[PDB]
Task: inverse folding
């Protein structure tokens, strides 16, 4: 558990991929199915840096009006934020200024990153030349794709540099130290290896030639 | 055209085997994606071997980190897959970490999938 931690609030229209981006950093999962977030979901993200560890307490808020409720509670004491839209949906970019107002109303001068998601998709509607919202010193923009992991760590790296005051701070990998051995029951292990050999109830995933 | 994704791979000089892969874990009745990464087999101070999977990112997110137990379920299935059962570390369900989980390790080719199945079984024995 790092001592250094910051509250980060993540906002944007529903369907823009806010939750999918957090899961990529949290568990590496990517769910094709759209399941809207209800209220807010708070997840901790730990990053190792050249100056020590950092923890972002990410408040992943719901983007849909009917699912978000009153958002002031999610924002208070937030020390940074991420605004997100979908480059395949021009409306989500039209609403970016609205999310920016709500954040500045409750949080004032916090470092914010603008992230245009789903750049992995060919038919892009919100192109970079068209994106001109960011103009200030406390605002930044990045193209990202939570599916292809394009600019994976950029939004957090920029926030960590502003929050720590070190333009040269760098993220580093976490060492993989030998874990504890887990003893299994031999009979149970035999039963598992049998269920594997015969029980193939779950279908093997489809063979995307990603590798 | 969608931008290319460039990654400076996190290297594990101490590994004696390393293969790019895609990882899945069985929950409900589906194999949920855990991400593309690189499977590493590394030495320990004992004769046991460390099974490590780092994500295909600049940060090398640790998707799996487990010592290979002697009686680890290990079976070859599919075109290019290898199944195993182990108590995941890092945990997949924080509430019930101790429960073993069935896991699918995909690799690019059937031949190199057959190779992964071989050396894993070789390291169960130690
Ligand atoms: N092609 C593509 N699809 C993506 C990407 N990120 C998310 N999606 C998809 O977009 C949909 C919405 O994702 P989700 O993470 O739930 O978005 P959200 O903004 O958290 N929704 P809500 O505000 O209601 O919680 C899902 O079908 C998800 O798989 C991406 O980078 N590329
Ligand atoms: Mg969501």
Result:
């Amino acid at each position: 558990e790092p001592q250094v931690q910051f509250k980060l609030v993540l906002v944007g229209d529903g369907g823009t991929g806010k939750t999918t981006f957090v899961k990529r950093h949290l568990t590496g999962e990517f769910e094709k199915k759209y399941v809207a977030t209800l209220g807010v979901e708070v997840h901790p993200l730990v990053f190792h840096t050249n100056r020590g560890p950092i923890k972002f307490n990410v408040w992943d808020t719901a983007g849909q009006e009917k699912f978000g409720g009153l958002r002031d509670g999610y924002y208070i004491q937030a020390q940074c934020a991420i605004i997100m839209f979908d480059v395949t949906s021009r409306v989500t970019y039209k609403n970016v200024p609205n999310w920016h107002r709500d954040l500045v109303r409750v949080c004032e001068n916090i470092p914010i990153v603008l992230c245009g998601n789903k750049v992995d998709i060919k038919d892009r509607k919100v192109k970079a030349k068209s994106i001109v919202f960011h103009r200030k010193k406390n605002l930044q923009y990045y193209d990202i794709s939570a599916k292809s992991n394009y600019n994976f760590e950029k939004p957090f790296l920029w926030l960590a540099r502003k929050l720590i005051g070190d333009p040269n701070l760098e993220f580093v990998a976490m060492p993989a130290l030998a874990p504890p051995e887990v003893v299994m029951d031999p009979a149970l292990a035999a039963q598992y290896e049998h269920d594997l050999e015969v029980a193939q109830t779950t279908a093997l995933p489809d063979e995307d030639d990603d590798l | 055209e969608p931008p290319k994704v460039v990654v400076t791979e996190v290297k594990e000089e101490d590994a004696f085997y390393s293969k790019k892969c895609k990882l899945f874990y069985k929950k409900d009745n589906e194999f949920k994606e855990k991400g593309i990464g690189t499977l590493h087999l590394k030495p320990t101070a004992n004769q046991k071997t460390q099974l490590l999977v780092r994500a295909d990112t600049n940060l090398g997110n640790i998707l799996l980190n487990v010592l290979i137990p002697p009686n680890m379920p290990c079976t070859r299935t599919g075109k290019n897959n290898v199944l195993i059962v182990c108590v995941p570390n890092p945990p997949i369900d924080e509430k019930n970490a101790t429960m073993p989980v069935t896991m699918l390790i995909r690799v690019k080719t059937s031949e190199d999938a057959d190779e992964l199945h071989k050396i894993l079984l070789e390291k169960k024995d130690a």
About this structure: Chain B touches chain A through 64 residues (CB under 8 Å). Helices of chain B lie at 110-125. The beta strands of chain B are 17-27, 30-43, 49-55, 62-67, 74-77, 81-86, 101-106.
